[PDB]
Structures are given as C-alpha cells and as structure tokens.
C-alpha cells in the first residue's frame, strides 16, 4: 500500500497474564496506550500528552469487544492453540559507549508468539530491579510481537550484562551477553 | 508442554498518501487473520473460512458498513491532521561519532526521521569499497540508530538528514 | 477538539 505515514490501532486479548493491551502506533512507534487496570491513557512521550488527550473508555470498550470475540472464536476454532514461535534477541547500547558516561542498554526481543514471556536484566549475575524499563508488546505485520527492554547503566570494563528471556517456544532460557 | 492459551487481536490501520486516507480493519485469531474491512472495497471480506459467517452478517447490516465507511474522514483524516505537528514534523538532531573499534565505524544516534544517508570520505574522496552499513535500528524510543563500517588503510563521516539544514561532519 | 478518535471493533456473529 502506497503510504507516506501509517497510523494503526493495535489491540490483543489472550488467556494468560497480558490479558489485554490497547495501543496506537505511528510508523511502528507507539504513541499512547490505555492502562486497563488504571483506566487511564498513558502517553509514551510527555510532549504527546500536552497536545492531545485520548478518551480511555475507547480502549476499554474495544478490549471488551475483543474479549467477546475471543470466546466466540475459541469455540468456533475448536480450541486450536497456535504453535509457539521462538524469539530472536539482540542487545545494543543506545549511545556509543563511553566509560563513566551514563548510557542506556536496549534488549530487543523480536518475532515471538504468543506475547507471554519472562524477561529480567542481569548485571554481573545479579538481578537489576532499578533503572529498568519495558515497552509494550508491539505488533508486527506477520501478527507476531516484539518487545523492548531498557536498562540505564554506567559502562565499566569489569561489568557484564545479560538479558534473560524466557519463552514457551524456547527450549531453554536464552541469555544475551553484552559487555564493553 | 506449552500451557493452554488462546489469543485474539486486531488492527485498525490508516494509510495516508497524497491527502487520501485508506482504512483497514483486520480481525485476527492466533495470528490467523480471518476478516478484513477495506475502505477501497467498501464492505467486509472473509480472509479464510473461519470468518465467512461474520463478514456476511456485517455486510447485511447497513449501519455497520456506514460506520466503517465514515472512518477514513472521522478518524484516519482527523487523527492524521491533529497529530501532524507531533508526528509528521517530529524532528530530532542526530549525534554522530566515529570510532576505530582495521575498520572504521560511524555511529549515528538520536534521529527520529528514519530516512538518513551516510557517506565516508577519505582525504576528501568518497570511498565505496568495504563500506557496509547496518540496517536502521529502531530503539523503540521514537529514536533511531545506524552504523556504517569502512575497510580503511591507515596512513571524515558526513551525514545528511531532514532535521539538519546543513550536513554534519565528524573528523 | 484536541482528542484523537477511535472506532469500535465489531462482534463476530455468534
């Protein structure tokens, strides 16, 4: 399709822990989403919320429609569960690495389905609970999902980082090692 | 033994081009798209046997069709114009750095307009041998990344961008 | 106004 820009509303309902997400992406970049537990709009960047204001009830309404469609589709599809797709993980820094200069490490998980996964950051073998940020399960054209994980860190030659991704399609938990 | 899990998703796509909005509404069950509305067609369509009864009922209701036919202007066009200054005109100045890591790397970071072109220059002479560039890396932060390699022989990296009125060089 | 619009998805025929 000839398109200078693409604006897409993406939403999924499922059985496991991510029961529902309702987002809106512009050129494969999420602009806002509704937090269904909080019933409020969440803007990806603060500059978005100052200019626009999205009605949260629209997202809750769409998720309620998709939930009815899921139950209807489960019986019509005779309880068919899709085959699990192993994810592809790549870890890269946001900025060129400079020792002592704060940087953000990005763990990109791509081409996985279903969008149910356990992801943790490991710095020198220990779990990092602070400075971690996770993106939503962003959609893909092949109807798979991809997710971003972020970790703010200060580079050091001694420190080594690992991105632990657990998925049903993975035979074993996958760890992507990154160091300076 | 993957646990029991059933998924249902959907896409409401607005395609903008030459001042024209084309609306697509997909109905997907476990990666299997079974129904679709196309503003060019003007009605629903069954992608597989799974969604035939659904598309036939939607096409039988005139108001369901009329609501979807008004989407290109009510939603696709309106959201395209309202978000224009924050989406179309979103400009970020790229930061360029060159490092030796013999190959030379020109790492360009923090630029939102994805379209960007990078050229190596040796003593004022652009080289095209041994030059391999990574594909555009989306950081998921509305910021992009790209690295260009260069097979050099030891004895400047210029970048052109929409946000940049004058190309930036790093020596 | 200053708000983006949304369109109801439809319910599959039961």
């Amino acid at each position: 399709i000839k398109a200078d820009h693409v604006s897409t509303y993406a939403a999924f309902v499922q059985t496991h822990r991510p029961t529902g997400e309702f987002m809106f992406e512009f050129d494969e970049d999420e602009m806002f989403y509704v937090d269904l537990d909080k019933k409020e709009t969440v803007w990806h960047l603060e500059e978005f919320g100052q200019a626009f204001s999205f009605e949260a009830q629209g997202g809750l309404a769409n998720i309620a429609i998709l939930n009815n469609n899921l139950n209807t589709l489960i019986q019509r599809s005779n309880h068919t569960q899709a085959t699990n797709d192993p994810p592809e993980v790549t870890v890269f820094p946001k900025e060129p690495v400079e020792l002592g200069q704060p940087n953000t490490l990005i763990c990109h998980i791509d081409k996985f389905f279903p969008p149910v996964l356990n992801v943790t950051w490991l710095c020198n073998g220990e779990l990092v609970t602070e400075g971690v940020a996770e993106s939503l399960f962003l959609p893909r054209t092949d109807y798979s999902f991809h997710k971003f994980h972020y970790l703010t860190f200060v580079p050091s030659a001694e420190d080594f980082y690992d991105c632990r991704v657990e998925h049903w399609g993975l035979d074993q938990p996958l760890l992507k090692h990154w160091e300076a | 033994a993957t646990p029991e899990n059933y998924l249902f998703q959907g896409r409401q796509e607005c395609y903008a081009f030459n001042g024209t909005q084309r609306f697509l509404e997909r109905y997907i069950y476990n990666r299997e798209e079974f129904a679709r509305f196309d503003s060019d067609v003007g009605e629903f369509r069954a992608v597989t046997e799974l969604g035939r009864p659904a598309a036939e009922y939607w096409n039988s209701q005139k108001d369901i069709l009329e609501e979807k036919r008004a989407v290109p202007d009510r939603m696709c066009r309106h959201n395209y114009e309202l978000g224009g200054p924050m989406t179309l005109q979103r400009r970020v100045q790229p930061r360029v750095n060159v490092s030796p890591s013999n190959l030379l790397v020109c790492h360009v970071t923090d630029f939102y307009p994805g379209s960007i072109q990078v050229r190596w220059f040796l003593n004022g002479q652009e080289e095209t041998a041994g030059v391999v560039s990574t594909n555009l890396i989306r950081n998921g932060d509305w910021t992009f990344q790209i690295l260009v390699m260069l097979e050099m022989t030891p004895q400047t990296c210029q970048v052109e961008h929409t946000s940049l009125d004058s190309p930036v060089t790093v020596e | 106004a200053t708000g983006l619009a949304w369109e109801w998805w439809r319910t599959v025929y039961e």
Partner: T-cell receptor
Framework: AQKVTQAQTEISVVEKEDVTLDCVYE???????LFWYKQPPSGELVFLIR??????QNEISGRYSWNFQKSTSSFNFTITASQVVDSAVYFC??????????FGSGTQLTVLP | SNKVTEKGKYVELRCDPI?????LYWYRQSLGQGPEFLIY????????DSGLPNDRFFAVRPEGSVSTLKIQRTERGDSAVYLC???????????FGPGTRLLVLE
C-alpha cells in the same frame, strides 16, 4: 455533548385530533441513531422507531409519522388521529458513539375523550 | 417484579435478556423522568461507559444469559425503577424488559 431535549411537559388533546411531539438531539458523533419509546401507564418502554443517521428520506406510512431534520437537529413524532389508548409518556433516545441510550426528558400525552 | 428493602440491607436485581442478544443494558428511571444509563454488558464482560452511581453499585453477567445488578448498603435515594434492555448485537435496537421497582424504606 450528547444530550436529548424534549421541552414539551404535557400535551392535552381530544380524540381524533393531531399531535406532534418534538425532540432536539444534540450529539457530536458522526454516525448516530435516534429512537422513540412509549411508556404506557404502569408499562414497559415500548419500541416505536429507529431512524439511522444516513437514512434521511421521511415518510408518513400510517398514523405514526417522523420528520428527521438534520438541519434543525430535530426528530418530531406526529400522530395523525388521536385515540385514548395513545395516551402515554413518549421518550426520545439517541445512540451512536455511545452504544447505550441517551434518553431525553418526558412528554406526557393525554388524549381526552 | 417489585422489591421492598429496609435501609442498609443488600439487594440484587435480576434481568433475563432475550435469547441470542449479545448486548445487555441496565437503566434506572426515577420519578417518571428520563431513564439513566447504568452499565453496558457485551457478553461476559462490561464495556460500560460507567453510569454506575457509587462503589455500592456493581453488576455481573457470567454467561451473557442473565445479568445481576447488586446494590450494597441500600439508601432511600437508591429507590427507583431499574429497567433492562437487550440488543441482538452492538448497535441494534434495544427492547426493554418490565424491570423491577426498588424501594428502600427506613
């Protein structure tokens, strides 16, 4: 916002006369749906009409009439020949972006004998 | 039906929709005024635009075959006629049931 206004509080006519109950819908939706409901004494809300936003051609088609004027944003219910059984409270409803109904106030018709 | 309840007691109201209707709506009508929207059910879930009055008002529809509006800590002001309408799909004509008149007495 989405609101329905029926300013006629009470209408009194003898039988075989003509009456016209009025609404003025007030919604921002692009596609809306208007309804008329009848609530007889100690009775349920009976369905009478549903005219969608796109269908604009008006008809008489019996004793019950409806004139959907998008210009005035009005929707007027007209009864040709009044019978004492038509004596009830009639309601104006509006739907669309909100799938539930935005009922108006009350118009009580009393067909006298 | 018609319900009478002493102030404070817990009440729940029942509504059986028509068969294939996937859309259930609760309305409340007070003093013959305009019916007020309460909650909108679409199958097993609530797509409501949240006309529910307080935290004391909650509703469920486990299988889409029947909804139950629950009122804890009944107050006199909660006394009204609670209507119930069902739509075949999301957007079809809604047909109201007889409703249950709630009355909260001191």
């Amino acid at each position: 916002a989405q609101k329905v206004t029926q300013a006629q509080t009470e209408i009194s006519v003898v039988e075989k006369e003509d009456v016209t109950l009025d609404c003025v819908y007030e919604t921002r939706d692009t596609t809306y749906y208007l309804f008329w409901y009848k609530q007889p004494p100690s009775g349920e809300l009976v369905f009478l009409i549903r005219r969608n936003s796109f269908d604009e051609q008006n008809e008489i088609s019996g004793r019950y009439s409806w004139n959907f004027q998008k210009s005035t944003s009005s929707f007027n219910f007209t009864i040709t020949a009044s019978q004492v059984v038509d004596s009830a409270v009639y309601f104006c409803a509006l739907s669309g972006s909100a799938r539930q109904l935005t009922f108006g106030s009350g118009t009580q018709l009393t067909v006298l004998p | 039906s018609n319900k009478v309840t002493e102030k404070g007691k817990y009440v729940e109201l029942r509504c059986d929709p028509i068969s294939g209707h996937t859309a259930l709506y609760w309305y409340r009508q007070s003093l013959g005024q305009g019916p007020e929207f309460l909650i909108y059910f679409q199958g097993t879930g609530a797509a409501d635009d949240s006309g529910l009055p307080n935290d004391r008002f909650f509703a469920v529809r486990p299988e889409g075959s029947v909804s139950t509006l629950k009122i804890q800590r009944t107050e006199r002001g909660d006394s009204a006629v609670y209507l119930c309408a069902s739509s075949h799909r999301e957007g079809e004509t809604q047909y109201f049931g007889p409703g249950t008149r709630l009355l909260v007495l001191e």
